[PDB]
Enzyme design. Sequence first.
Site, short mmCIF file in Angstrom:
data_model
loop_
_atom_site.label_atom_id
_atom_site.label_comp_id
_atom_site.label_asym_id
_atom_site.label_seq_id
_atom_site.Cartn_x
_atom_site.Cartn_y
_atom_site.Cartn_z
CG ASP A 1 -11.96 2.37 -1.49
OD1 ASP A 1 -10.48 2.41 -1.87
OD2 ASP A 1 -12.06 3.16 -0.59
CB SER B 1 -8.19 3.95 -6.90
OG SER B 1 -8.58 4.84 -5.87
CG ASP C 1 2.52 -1.32 2.89
OD1 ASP C 1 3.24 -1.88 2.28
OD2 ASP C 1 2.17 0.03 2.56
CD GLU D 1 -13.20 1.52 5.34
OE1 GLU D 1 -13.64 1.99 4.51
OE2 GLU D 1 -12.06 1.96 5.95
CG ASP E 1 -7.25 7.79 -6.30
OD1 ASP E 1 -8.21 7.55 -6.48
OD2 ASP E 1 -6.25 7.34 -5.80
CG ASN F 1 -11.15 5.80 -3.58
OD1 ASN F 1 -10.61 4.81 -3.64
ND2 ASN F 1 -12.19 5.99 -2.54
CG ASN G 1 -7.70 2.39 -3.36
OD1 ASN G 1 -6.69 2.87 -4.07
ND2 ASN G 1 -8.90 3.13 -3.37
#
Length: 129
Positions: free
Chosen positions: A52, A50, A101, A35, A48, A46, A59
């Site tokens: 990270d 967003s 999650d 990562e 979209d 990202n 995110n």
Amino acid sequence: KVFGRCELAAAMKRHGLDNYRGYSLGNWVCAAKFESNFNTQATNRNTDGSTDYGILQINSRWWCNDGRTPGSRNLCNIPCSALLSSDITASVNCAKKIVSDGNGMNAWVAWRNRCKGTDVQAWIRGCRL
Ligand SMILES: [Cl-]
Ligand SMILES: [Cl-]
Ligand SMILES: [Cl-]
Ligand SMILES: [Cl-]
Ligand SMILES: [Cl-]
Ligand SMILES: [Cl-]
Ligand SMILES: [Cl-]
Ligand SMILES: [Cl-]
Ligand code: NA
């Protein structure tokens, strides 16, 4: 801060990540390697909109607030900037929520694609832990 491999393993263990939700320490070090290359200051936008953040590239769409991700949540209740600290406490505490999650460490696409099913113990081999 750019951690060493064993240095990060030790920090993750001190913060309770070793075998958290059944994921051995090598899984967490492997995910951090791919990562962020162990760099707490890593950020990556990202498609979209967003972003990270940090050693585990958490995110802004769901987990932290950066003020520029429309419609997002802040489920770890932290500014995303907290995820860039040399102190990994915020990233670890938020990662514990993420891995709980429902989909385990598959939440980290790079873990699924580069760590899952591999000899992840190699990432902590040799370390005084
Ligand atoms: Cl390495
Ligand atoms: Cl472990
Ligand atoms: Cl391991
Ligand atoms: Cl936002
Ligand atoms: Cl929220
Ligand atoms: Cl905030
Ligand atoms: Cl730390
Ligand atoms: Cl799981
Ligand atoms: Na957010």
